[PDB]
Amino acid sequence: TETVGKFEFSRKDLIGHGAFAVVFKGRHREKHDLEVAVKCINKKNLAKSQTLLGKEIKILKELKHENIVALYDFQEMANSVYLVMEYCNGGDLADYLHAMRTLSEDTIRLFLQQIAGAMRLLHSKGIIHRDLKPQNILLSNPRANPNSIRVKIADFGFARYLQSNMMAATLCGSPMYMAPEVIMSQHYDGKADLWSIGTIVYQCLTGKAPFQASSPQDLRLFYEKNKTLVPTIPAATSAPLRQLLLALLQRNHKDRMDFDEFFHHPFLD
Numbered sequence: 001t002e003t004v005g006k007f008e009f010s011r012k013d014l015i016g017h018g019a020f021a022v023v024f025k026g027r028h029r030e031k032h033d034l035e036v037a038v039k040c041i042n043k044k045n046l047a048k049s050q051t052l053l054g055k056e057i058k059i060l061k062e063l064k065h066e067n068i069v070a071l072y073d074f075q076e077m078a079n080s081v082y083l084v085m086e087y088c089n090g091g092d093l094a095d096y097l098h099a100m101r102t103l104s105e106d107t108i109r110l111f112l113q114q115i116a117g118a119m120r121l122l123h124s125k126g127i128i129h130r131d132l133k134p135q136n137i138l139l140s141n142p143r144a145n146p147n148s149i150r151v152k153i154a155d156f157g158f159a160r161y162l163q164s165n166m167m168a169a170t171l172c173g174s175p176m177y178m179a180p181e182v183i184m185s186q187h188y189d190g191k192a193d194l195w196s197i198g199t200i201v202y203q204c205l206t207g208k209a210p211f212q213a214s215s216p217q218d219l220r221l222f223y224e225k226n227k228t229l230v231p232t233i234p235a236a237t238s239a240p241l242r243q244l245l246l247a248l249l250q251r252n253h254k255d256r257m258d259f260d261e262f263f264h265h266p267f268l269d
């Protein structure tokens, strides 16, 4: 039993062991029914793990939202960092998709409405996530309201503030979810995240990536050679969902849907 402020956990109660964090279940030390997740350095990748967890503290201490995993406390030192976070008892979207194979439009809509709510806060704060993918979208059952299941965006280790007249250029994220401009080593902005979201939505709908390749390098070459990208959308797809996907999965960020359009899109009614 280790303690971090008013919280405790045991390293028996593993949640998961990523390359840049190890996460354990724990609880408040007074209020034992308040569950938490405690994120720790992965010493196999100490320097990078420490950097990412420090960056996550900097971003998350500024974000309170129902659809973003909450940072309850943290403890940063020269050689160790801990985050104490809201426990998401439903696990990740990736595991859910692995079981469901595909999601109905109504479920996509429920989840996407919540993601958009989170993204509205990020966009208003000038923050880009840069690693949106099903492994970083968590589910929580916190319930006498309709559709009480909650989506929570996690893993802000790669996120940054981006001033509204500036472009980012750091290469980070997961190749299969990365916007073309990102993986082609160009300058990008907040619309890179909208591509990632479009690819998650497409994956939920069809069970596949919109643009398949054998490796990151292959996917890059594919985007380089194809000046327009058109995802294959099933004929059964509703017209608002088809239009949303086509507007999100535009190769060129200038042509891609922007935030205001995304938040007010007919599909999300």
Ligand SMILES: CCC(=O)Nc1cccc(Oc2nc(Nc3ccc(N4CCN(C)CC4)cc3OC)ncc2Cl)c1
Pocket (backbone or CB within 6 Å): 015, 016, 017, 018, 023, 037, 038, 039, 069, 085, 086, 087, 088, 089, 090, 091, 092, 095, 135, 136, 138, 154, 155
């Ligand atoms: C390798 C999986 C992992 O550790 N992934 C992850 C990714 C992002 C954040 C995170 O931390 C948290 N995880 C949870 N919950 C949670 C997260 C992941 C799972 N998995 C993921 C897939 N595995 C195959 C099974 C369990 C189970 C979980 O509960 C039940 N709740 C709060 C935080 Cl801060 C953990």
Ligand SMILES: [Mg+2]
Pocket (backbone or CB within 6 Å): 179, 181, 187, 188, 189, 190, 191, 192, 253
């Ligand atoms: Mg961009």
